[PDB]
DNA sequence: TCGGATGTATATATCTGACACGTGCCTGGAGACTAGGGAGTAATCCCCTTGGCGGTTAAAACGCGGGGGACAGCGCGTACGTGCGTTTAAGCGGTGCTAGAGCTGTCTACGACCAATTGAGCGGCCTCGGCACCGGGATTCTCGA
DNA sequence: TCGAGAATCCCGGTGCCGAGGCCGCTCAATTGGTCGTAGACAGCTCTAGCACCGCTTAAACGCACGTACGCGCTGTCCCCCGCGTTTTAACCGCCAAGGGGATTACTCCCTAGTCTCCAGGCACGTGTCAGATATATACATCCGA
């Protein structure tokens, strides 16, 4: 008789912690009853997206444990994640390899 | 800018713009301290 | 007394392979000789506009130490969001 | 008697520095800079270390973005050598001044 | 002698279910922790300003959906909207 | 706003005076950073090299 | 259904905006590039305006929705609503 | 047989347009533009009028700021005539692309 | 008969006639000043609420409003508005 | 076109110290109930938006003719990389000590909460002066000699 | 060094419609109480920060020095700009018809809140392998003759 709402919806991120963060956060007077579920789904999807583009760079550069340089490249190589994370300095980041084409000899 | 706003500007900044000091030409003279562009107001020559 | 804080340098402490080194992380081929003074000026302006808000949160919290969250909060206000210290 | 044609060392250092990530400015002169300009707002503070590292990361990223937009300006003016009127143009356009 | 609101075990489990044979370091875990907190704050705050604009006093699934459609860019927005609607329907049908 | 409204010889205040009153000042322009006043207009500004100059005689 | 209205922005009107910008002399490609940039900006505003209008169930885009979208953009129009 | 030296009409129009404030683009072609590109997101909407005026003010201010930063670029390249690589440079530097 | 709406028109009228004797105002200028005061109120209340969440307190005192004004306003204008606020509160107490 | 002469990914042996994993335990997250209050839904009316038709004309469109800036070509020496040698401050271990950050009871006084009261403040409706327009003289630069 | 000339700012008449103000009339601000817990405070740890120390060494600075390209100059040319003549749709002013948006009234059922109970996450103690580091080593590639 202990079915957590993560099981009852099928997701992985919790919904009780999201419900407590909504009621404590003073964002509005009445938290709904499906809104923290929906938001747990959205957070699970974006985490899955960034880790999916991380793992490709991880296997391409032969390591097996993801580092912030892999995260920097996994974010900055994409077209629309670069517009999402508009200006974010990621620690240990580095930049994309790019040389202007009017300086090659 | 139109005229009376710059007249207000004049009454503001004519104290800090210029200065009277010992000239080598003849006795004293009016120096200049702030770098003036060609066209602005400098001071109002007012008295009785 | 007891406090020895007579400091005049440390704008020169950002030395002069260092701005060259940042420029060649940036992908820059050939640099003039006034870029050094101009870069030191811009760096001083930016670090002032962050340290001001950092010390303001540190005073308002009624503490004496500027923890990392306060720096993250200052940079969050500026628009340059920083990840990886909370 | 063996010396390179000039520019080769420049391009290979560009690739050599873009293929790595680390702190690039030496840390104790930057820490003394931060404490010296923090003197003027509240006397005798007490920093941590991670706040200093966060400041170094923010300043490093800001300078790198500034130099890349400067280099775009200098290539636009049909030149190669960066002159400081380019930097002043970039900070005039971006809106920080 | 305290507690702490980390998301480490959750990103562990999602990483297990998206790549069967890799792990993740500490600093990357902290970056993902701050990333999820930041995305949560932006979406919740946009939703709350919607609730204040429309003179109503309850955040619901429809307001979270409109915060998602405003904040995210296009293709990723359609993906996240479909994921959320699937999760809500599978929550409430077998409720 | 009132100073500019007198100094253009008008009774009331129309928003052109507000645009001039903010953008002539230094600190209020930094406060109203990303702001467009409706019906505002801009400051009169012409660059230094777009206007001719005379050499001979 | 409509057509051709991006050419409704004329040749002198772009020249008039250039003169208020304080511009001496224009080339002949600025017209094409200007229509491109203006169409991009109008799409990026009208998307969020219509998103607010669909959320509040109405079929009308008032001035308050436009001002909310511009508040999100970072431009903050005054003088309406 | 009386004609000006070229450029005089340009400078006097610059002062003549900076000494005034009004709507500058003719209003009905801009309204038809706004309705035509609003077709693609939701069919058969119903605008007010003040929303259209707000859009016209926002677009007018954005174009004026863009042209002034373009003119700064074109003066920086030791030219006078604006060419569209200046505009593309300005929108590359500002961060909108 | 319409539903009563908020506005700050009368108070701008009063401050305008206290600082200029014979200078009126238009309609559009009144809407601009209304939206201006709404903007400054939203920004300062947002900063104070975020401070209250950071410090693990739950109550907006005057201290957070002073801190928010010192953060958000640039320099000398802040050093005058702090004095205006403190003088008004101390004249309110006694 | 080649030789040489550089630095550059590349196969392997060893460590470590940072990361994967039991465990217990607890405190916050599932189960039940209860009221009441925010929100769904019908109806309306009346406000506003959209559409259409003729009239004037301000303004866009479009050739003409040209001369002034954009651009290509060319010469130099000032200024900046490249390398080599010659100092120094930056890391880096251990130590200590200690000011201060953080944590536990304890007790108020200050703000929530609710009942009854009126005057500050918005809506509708006048009135009238600043501003808009018309028209003419003084002025003030430009452009061919 | 001039003078034709074409806008242009300054100045005062005629008209009108946005703005300031005044009465009426609500409904939210004000006053007067209770009552609880959020917070101010005294005290009590114990842990990171700052200062100190020697030692080692990558790194920074000075100095030649060759060189290449930013800058200056000249030519040429073509395309953008003033302008005269010609259409055309922007606008205004209007009537007209109907979609939809605030608005109120009314059930209603979804959630704030309370009480009970118990396992999911977390702090903590484990061992142990992913990639760093070291060492040769074929191999890409820059530059003169």
Coordinates of N, CA and C in Angstrom, one line a residue, chain I:
Chain I
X1 N -21.0 53.2 -16.0 CA -20.7 52.2 -15.0 C -19.6 51.2 -15.6
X2 N -18.4 51.2 -15.0 CA -17.4 50.2 -15.3 C -16.8 49.8 -14.0
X3 N -16.1 48.6 -14.1 CA -15.4 48.1 -12.9 C -14.2 48.9 -12.6
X4 N -14.0 49.3 -11.3 CA -13.0 50.2 -10.9 C -11.6 49.6 -11.0
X5 N -10.8 50.4 -11.7 CA -9.4 50.0 -12.0 C -8.4 50.8 -11.3
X6 N -7.2 50.2 -11.0 CA -6.1 51.0 -10.4 C -5.5 51.9 -11.4
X7 N -4.9 52.9 -10.9 CA -4.1 53.9 -11.6 C -3.4 54.8 -10.6
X8 N -2.3 55.4 -11.0 CA -1.6 56.3 -10.2 C -1.6 57.7 -10.7
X9 N -2.8 58.1 -11.3 CA -2.9 59.4 -12.0 C -2.9 60.6 -11.0
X10 N -3.7 60.5 -9.9 CA -3.8 61.5 -8.9 C -2.5 61.8 -8.2
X11 N -1.7 60.8 -8.0 CA -0.5 61.1 -7.2 C 0.6 61.7 -8.0
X12 N 0.6 61.4 -9.3 CA 1.5 62.1 -10.2 C 1.0 63.5 -10.4
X13 N -0.3 63.8 -10.4 CA -0.8 65.2 -10.4 C -0.3 65.9 -9.2
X14 N -0.3 65.3 -8.0 CA 0.0 66.0 -6.8 C 1.5 66.3 -6.7
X15 N 2.4 65.3 -7.1 CA 3.8 65.5 -7.1 C 4.2 66.5 -8.2
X16 N 3.5 66.5 -9.3 CA 3.8 67.5 -10.4 C 3.4 68.9 -9.9
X17 N 2.3 69.1 -9.3 CA 2.0 70.4 -8.8 C 2.8 70.8 -7.6
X18 N 3.4 69.8 -6.9 CA 4.4 70.3 -5.8 C 5.7 70.7 -6.3
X19 N 6.1 70.1 -7.5 CA 7.5 70.5 -8.0 C 7.5 71.5 -9.1
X20 N 6.3 71.7 -9.8 CA 6.2 72.8 -10.7 C 4.8 73.4 -10.5
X21 N 4.7 74.7 -10.4 CA 3.4 75.3 -10.1 C 2.4 75.3 -11.3
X22 N 2.9 75.6 -12.5 CA 2.0 75.9 -13.6 C 2.4 75.1 -14.8
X23 N 2.7 73.8 -14.6 CA 3.0 73.0 -15.8 C 2.2 71.7 -15.7
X24 N 1.3 71.5 -16.7 CA 0.4 70.4 -16.7 C 1.1 69.1 -17.2
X25 N 0.2 68.2 -17.7 CA 0.7 67.0 -18.3 C -0.3 66.5 -19.3
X26 N 0.1 65.6 -20.2 CA -0.8 65.1 -21.2 C -1.4 63.8 -20.7
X27 N -2.0 63.0 -21.6 CA -2.6 61.7 -21.3 C -1.5 60.6 -21.4
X28 N -0.8 60.7 -22.6 CA 0.2 59.7 -22.9 C 1.4 59.7 -21.9
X29 N 1.7 60.9 -21.4 CA 2.7 61.0 -20.4 C 2.2 60.4 -19.1
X30 N 0.9 60.5 -18.8 CA 0.4 59.9 -17.6 C 0.5 58.4 -17.7
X31 N 0.2 57.8 -18.9 CA 0.3 56.4 -19.1 C 1.7 55.9 -18.9
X32 N 2.7 56.7 -19.4 CA 4.1 56.4 -19.3 C 4.5 56.4 -17.9
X33 N 4.1 57.4 -17.1 CA 4.5 57.4 -15.7 C 3.8 56.3 -14.9
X34 N 2.6 56.0 -15.2 CA 1.9 54.8 -14.6 C 2.7 53.5 -14.8
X35 N 3.1 53.3 -16.1 CA 3.8 52.0 -16.3 C 5.2 52.1 -15.8
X36 N 5.8 53.3 -15.6 CA 7.1 53.4 -15.0 C 7.1 53.0 -13.6
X37 N 6.1 53.5 -12.8 CA 6.1 53.2 -11.4 C 5.7 51.7 -11.2
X38 N 4.9 51.2 -12.1 CA 4.6 49.7 -12.0 C 5.9 48.9 -12.3
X39 N 6.8 49.3 -13.2 CA 8.0 48.7 -13.4 C 8.9 48.7 -12.2
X40 N 9.1 49.8 -11.6 CA 10.1 50.0 -10.5 C 9.6 49.2 -9.3
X41 N 8.2 49.1 -9.1 CA 7.7 48.3 -8.0 C 7.9 46.9 -8.3
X42 N 7.7 46.4 -9.5 CA 7.9 45.0 -9.8 C 9.3 44.5 -9.5
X43 N 10.3 45.4 -10.0 CA 11.7 45.0 -9.9 C 12.1 44.9 -8.4
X44 N 11.7 46.0 -7.6 CA 12.2 46.0 -6.2 C 11.5 44.9 -5.4
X45 N 10.2 44.7 -5.6 CA 9.6 43.6 -4.9 C 10.1 42.2 -5.3
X46 N 10.5 42.1 -6.5 CA 11.2 40.8 -6.9 C 12.5 40.6 -6.2
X47 N 13.3 41.6 -6.2 CA 14.6 41.5 -5.5 C 14.5 41.2 -4.0
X48 N 13.5 41.9 -3.4 CA 13.3 41.7 -2.0 C 12.8 40.3 -1.7
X49 N 11.9 39.8 -2.6 CA 11.4 38.4 -2.4 C 12.5 37.4 -2.6
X50 N 13.4 37.6 -3.5 CA 14.5 36.7 -3.7 C 15.5 36.7 -2.6
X51 N 15.7 37.9 -2.0 CA 16.6 38.0 -0.8 C 15.9 37.2 0.4
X52 N 14.6 37.4 0.5 CA 13.9 36.7 1.6 C 14.0 35.2 1.4
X53 N 14.0 34.7 0.2 CA 14.1 33.2 0.0 C 15.6 32.8 0.2
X54 N 16.5 33.6 -0.1 CA 17.9 33.2 0.1 C 18.3 33.2 1.6
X55 N 17.8 34.1 2.4 CA 18.2 34.2 3.7 C 17.5 33.3 4.7
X56 N 16.6 32.4 4.2 CA 15.8 31.6 5.1 C 15.0 32.3 6.1
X57 N 14.5 33.5 5.7 CA 13.5 34.2 6.5 C 12.2 34.1 5.7
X58 N 11.2 34.8 6.2 CA 9.8 34.7 5.6 C 9.1 36.1 5.6
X59 N 9.8 37.2 6.0 CA 9.1 38.4 6.2 C 9.9 39.5 5.5
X60 N 9.2 40.3 4.6 CA 9.7 41.5 4.1 C 9.8 42.6 5.2
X61 N 10.9 42.9 5.7 CA 11.1 44.1 6.5 C 11.4 45.2 5.7
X62 N 11.9 46.3 6.3 CA 12.4 47.4 5.5 C 13.8 47.2 5.1
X63 N 14.5 46.3 5.8 CA 15.9 46.0 5.5 C 16.1 45.4 4.1
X64 N 15.2 44.5 3.7 CA 15.3 44.0 2.4 C 15.0 45.0 1.3
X65 N 14.1 45.9 1.6 CA 13.8 47.0 0.6 C 15.0 47.9 0.4
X66 N 15.7 48.2 1.5 CA 16.9 49.0 1.4 C 18.0 48.3 0.6
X67 N 18.1 47.0 0.9 CA 19.2 46.2 0.2 C 18.8 46.1 -1.3
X68 N 17.5 46.0 -1.7 CA 17.1 45.9 -3.1 C 17.3 47.2 -3.8
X69 N 17.1 48.3 -3.1 CA 17.3 49.6 -3.8 C 18.8 49.9 -3.9
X70 N 19.6 49.5 -3.0 CA 21.0 49.7 -3.1 C 21.6 48.8 -4.2
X71 N 21.1 47.6 -4.4 CA 21.5 46.8 -5.5 C 21.1 47.4 -6.9
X72 N 19.8 47.7 -7.0 CA 19.3 48.0 -8.4 C 19.5 49.4 -8.8
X73 N 19.7 50.4 -7.9 CA 19.9 51.7 -8.5 C 21.3 52.1 -8.7
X74 N 21.7 52.8 -9.7 CA 23.1 53.1 -10.0 C 23.7 54.2 -9.2
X75 N 24.4 53.9 -8.1 CA 25.3 54.9 -7.4 C 24.6 56.0 -6.7
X76 N 24.7 57.2 -7.2 CA 24.4 58.4 -6.5 C 22.9 58.5 -6.4
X77 N 22.1 58.0 -7.3 CA 20.7 58.0 -7.2 C 20.2 57.1 -6.1
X78 N 21.0 56.0 -5.9 CA 20.7 55.2 -4.7 C 21.1 55.9 -3.4
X79 N 22.2 56.6 -3.4 CA 22.6 57.3 -2.2 C 21.6 58.5 -1.8
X80 N 20.8 58.9 -2.8 CA 19.8 59.9 -2.4 C 18.5 59.2 -2.0
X81 N 18.1 58.1 -2.7 CA 16.8 57.4 -2.4 C 16.8 56.7 -1.1
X82 N 18.0 56.2 -0.7 CA 18.1 55.6 0.7 C 17.8 56.7 1.8
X83 N 18.3 57.9 1.6 CA 18.1 59.0 2.5 C 16.6 59.4 2.6
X84 N 16.0 59.4 1.4 CA 14.6 59.7 1.3 C 13.7 58.7 2.0
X85 N 14.1 57.4 1.9 CA 13.3 56.4 2.5 C 13.5 56.4 4.0
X86 N 14.7 56.6 4.5 CA 14.9 56.6 5.9 C 14.3 57.7 6.6
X87 N 14.3 58.9 6.0 CA 13.6 60.1 6.5 C 12.1 59.9 6.6
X88 N 11.5 59.2 5.6 CA 10.1 59.0 5.6 C 9.7 58.0 6.7
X89 N 10.4 57.0 6.9 CA 10.1 56.0 7.9 C 10.2 56.6 9.3
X90 N 11.3 57.4 9.5 CA 11.5 57.9 10.9 C 10.5 59.0 11.1
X91 N 10.0 59.8 10.1 CA 8.9 60.6 10.4 C 7.6 59.9 10.5
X92 N 7.5 58.7 10.1 CA 6.3 57.9 10.3 C 6.2 57.3 11.7
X93 N 7.3 57.0 12.3 CA 7.3 56.3 13.6 C 6.8 57.2 14.7
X94 N 7.4 58.3 14.9 CA 7.0 59.2 16.0 C 5.9 60.2 15.4

